[PDB]
Design a protein around this ligand. Sequence first.
Ligand SMILES: *[C@@H]1O[C@H](CO)[C@@H](O[C@@H]2O[C@H](CO)[C@@H](O[C@H]3O[C@H](CO)[C@@H](O)[C@H](O[C@H]4O[C@H](CO)[C@@H](O)[C@H](O)[C@@H]4O)[C@@H]3O)[C@H](O)[C@H]2NC(C)=O)[C@H](O)[C@H]1NC(C)=O
Ligand SMILES: *[C@@H]1O[C@H](CO)[C@@H](O[C@@H]2O[C@H](CO)[C@@H](O[C@@H]3O[C@H](CO)[C@@H](O)[C@H](O)[C@@H]3O)[C@H](O)[C@H]2NC(C)=O)[C@H](O)[C@H]1NC(C)=O
Ligand SMILES: *[C@@H]1O[C@H](CO)[C@@H](O[C@@H]2O[C@H](CO)[C@@H](O)[C@H](O)[C@H]2NC(C)=O)[C@H](O)[C@H]1NC(C)=O
Ligand SMILES: COC1=C(OC)Cc2c(ncnc2N2CCC(CNS(N)(=O)=O)CC2)C1
Ligand SMILES: *[C@@H]1O[C@H](CO)[C@@H](O)[C@H](O)[C@H]1NC(C)=O
Ligand SMILES: [Ca+2]
Ligand SMILES: [Zn+2]
Length: 817
Amino acid sequence: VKSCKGRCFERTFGNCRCDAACVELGNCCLDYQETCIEPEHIWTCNKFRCGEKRLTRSLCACSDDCKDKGDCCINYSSVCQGEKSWVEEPCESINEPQCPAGFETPPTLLFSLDGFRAEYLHTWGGLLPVISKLKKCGTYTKNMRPVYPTKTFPNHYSIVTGLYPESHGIIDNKMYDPKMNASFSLKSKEKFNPEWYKGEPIWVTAKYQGLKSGTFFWPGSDVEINGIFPDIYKMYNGSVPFEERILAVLQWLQLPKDERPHFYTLYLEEPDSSGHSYGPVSSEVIKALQRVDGMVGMLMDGLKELNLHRCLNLILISDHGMEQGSCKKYIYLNKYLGDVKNIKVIYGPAARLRPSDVPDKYYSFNYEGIARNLSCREPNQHFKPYLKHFLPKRLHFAKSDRIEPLTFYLDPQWQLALNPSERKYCGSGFHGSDNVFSNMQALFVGYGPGFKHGIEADTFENIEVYNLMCDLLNLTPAPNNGTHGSLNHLLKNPVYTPKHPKEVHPLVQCPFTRNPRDNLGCSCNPSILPIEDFQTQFNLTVAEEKIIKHETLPYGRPRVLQKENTICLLSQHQFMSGYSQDILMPLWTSYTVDRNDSFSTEDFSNCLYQDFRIPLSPVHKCSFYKNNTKVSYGFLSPPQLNKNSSGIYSEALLTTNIVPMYQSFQVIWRYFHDTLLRKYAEERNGVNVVSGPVFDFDYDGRCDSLENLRQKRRVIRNQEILIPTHFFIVLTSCKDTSQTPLHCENLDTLAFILPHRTDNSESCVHGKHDSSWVEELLMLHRARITDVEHITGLSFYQQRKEPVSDILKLKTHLPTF
Ligand SMILES: *[C@@H]1O[C@H](CO)[C@@H](O[C@@H]2O[C@H](CO)[C@@H](O[C@H]3O[C@H](CO)[C@@H](O)[C@H](O[C@H]4O[C@H](CO)[C@@H](O)[C@H](O)[C@@H]4O)[C@@H]3O)[C@H](O)[C@H]2NC(C)=O)[C@H](O)[C@H]1NC(C)=O
Ligand SMILES: *[C@@H]1O[C@H](CO)[C@@H](O[C@@H]2O[C@H](CO)[C@@H](O[C@@H]3O[C@H](CO)[C@@H](O)[C@H](O)[C@@H]3O)[C@H](O)[C@H]2NC(C)=O)[C@H](O)[C@H]1NC(C)=O
Ligand SMILES: *[C@@H]1O[C@H](CO)[C@@H](O[C@@H]2O[C@H](CO)[C@@H](O)[C@H](O)[C@H]2NC(C)=O)[C@H](O)[C@H]1NC(C)=O
Ligand SMILES: COC1=C(OC)Cc2c(ncnc2N2CCC(CNS(N)(=O)=O)CC2)C1
Ligand SMILES: *[C@@H]1O[C@H](CO)[C@@H](O)[C@H](O)[C@H]1NC(C)=O
Ligand SMILES: [Ca+2]
Ligand SMILES: [Zn+2]
């Protein structure tokens, strides 16, 4: 008589009513809405609904007969039978999977929350119980590094291909390809054009090895790629309620085994939507985080109902983070260029510039003009123009023709457009910035049989996830930019054991040859003590050699993986090196700076000693470089460094230890070796160094072939010389600063791929002290050891006692400060 329970929509005698007319009259029973209406609009049971008379319009049932008819709401057992929800159960380990027939290989589900910045879980974890329990019981990293630009289509497509955007071709939501003379838009028919989507998404990889796939939304899953769609896919429709997407994937997981997928995707637009609309710190984002947390709960609760919660491997992930934009932190190019109508500028933090007249002027247009026009125009300028090949190599953002030849690097929180007309609300949340900025860092949680429990893994890159998902599905990965085995530490039972790459030809020898003590045109500083008997000073005892190797190559010698290549090892007291007869230059030197080693200020300009182990060549003489305006030289192993005296190490002045070096770059090189290397040595109680030249004329992140390099020599004073595109440096100390680099239990690395440029316009040297800008340029141009390996054709640390997987982990690390 007081309640609608069991009498929805029926006439009553006893006071309160349960028909739609009651609301106007305000004579409804107090539980009319909860009992009779809400069930049409909600996917949950509650205390009002437990044992409800079945309603025909209800989205799911909480009626006693719901289990028989198999349409109980997912939380039925939790709420109406008093059982515990997935989130309410304590963690318990999944050593053996408990899977049905068909899942002898257990399924993997890639669940994306768009624009879930890593920080959201750091800060609001107390409000996110489900994602928090997955972290607790699973494999988590505080930060998963996205690809540049930190945008949705690029990162989603990267996750499922293991490719950098420059390689997979989806470099933004809006693109122009000049070869195609077509434009890419998400609003357009070209969105569906397979020409745009390169590489191999995992759903294709899986199909070729006989696994079916179900994608409830993912970029590319609605495109015929290598002639294939996912076995089940959905046309993107953001209006589909989240509950309906999760319920559909749970339907797919009950398909008969012959047609049931192994690889699944789930995607939600939150918290990216709220993040843009109201900012990353906002009531709206908190509410969205709680919503997606609940949807993750609905999935886990559903998997429990299906006895699949100790079967399915879940990867909960995000494309990128989110940052607070400001109208006071937006740069307009028209301030510097005027209201010109010949250029189209892509707005935001990953801003790019292209001529209007395309494809005609795309290559011919004067990029360098605008580049210099916009450089160092203000002090503490919040943007920097870059020809795409001069962007830090760590960003891997240049190979694709779809990348405009002039790009901008924006500071944290800063964005750029041509003018205020061509951009949306500047006060909005945004992303797209440098993929090492904290607020761009992304979510990763792995949970399931395949993944470890209660592990917090060090930061890794989303490009490594493709190989990981391949391992979880026992697939052979297509070729990608992940280092296979670098994430073996995340897996209970790694399926791929990596091996160090095998050197193609063993080292040729460079034996001493009796030759004249020839004139090099050098006016040596008198202090320097020349090499009085070369054959004496460089005929070393096997006892003497063991000591040198142990001090200079404590991790083994860099191995060379290039096919057509001839290198020779050169021995010295303070350093070892690999010399290329082919390019008249070392590919690498290795030396070790100890805590209390001495760095000399004594000048050593215009001083070289001939090396009788290689033929003398014109480019090895001080004469070639004397008042040469076009190129100078520099030393890999530093002459400044003496272990024996406080003077200058003469052996470092050999012709074999010099590389072509622009005068401008000497400022950087001299500051590094004089100042920084000393500080690094003191700070870390010794540091092993390996440095060398880099030739990437294709700007493709890879060492150029010898064949290619022959056509890229410059002719200077009627000599053929090869000038490095970059110089690499790899510092190595111990995690424990008590031990020196020769006896590390654990390696701490720091590597650089410094661009080799004829001016230092990059750094805006004007009215600034020298110290500041060099350190900043090194930090911007840091790189993974793996980045160095790719671009030099070298392979480091091959003689370490550590297993290979642990080395790959170390090699793929990028330091962040
Ligand atoms: C990230 O991973 C990617 C995959 O491992 C790497 O990209 C691959 O780079 C190679 C080197 O260019 C490229 O392979 C090809 O080599 C030929 C050049 O010698 C190229 O022409 C070949 O392709 C083809 O030739 C015809 C006519 O030109 C083409 O129409 C056809 O495509 C035919 O197969 C050959 O494929 C790959 O193209 C490329 N893959 C992708 C998807 O980009 C990156 O090197 C790597 N990046 C880093 C920094 O590690
Ligand atoms: C994109 O997804 C949205 C949300 O799922 C779709 O809109 C919804 O469409 C349904 C039916 O497709 C509508 O429901 C009702 O359908 C019955 C059909 O018999 C009809 O009697 C009702 O009057 C009502 O129309 C619903 O109104 C609609 N919106 C909401 C709020 O759920 C949409 O169809 C999808 N497709 C595209 C491409 O937009
Ligand atoms: C490249 O694409 C541009 C833009 O689509 C082409 O310009 C079009 O030319 C056609 C006929 O050739 C005209 O009917 C259109 O009105 C033009 N569109 C626009 C917006 O200008 C251009 O001709 C294409 N081909 C090449 C290789 O330049
Ligand atoms: C099925 O594959 C597709 C998708 O898989 C997810 C997404 C998508 C597609 N086409 C156009 N736009 C798309 N979206 C990406 C970005 C996405 C954030 N917008 S938000 N967070 O404001 O609501 C909203 C638009 C196709
Ligand atoms: C840069 O060129 C523009 C034309 O786009 C011109 O308005 C401006 O004066 C130039 N700025 C300079 C010379 O730095
Ligand atoms: Ca190259
Ligand atoms: Zn977004």
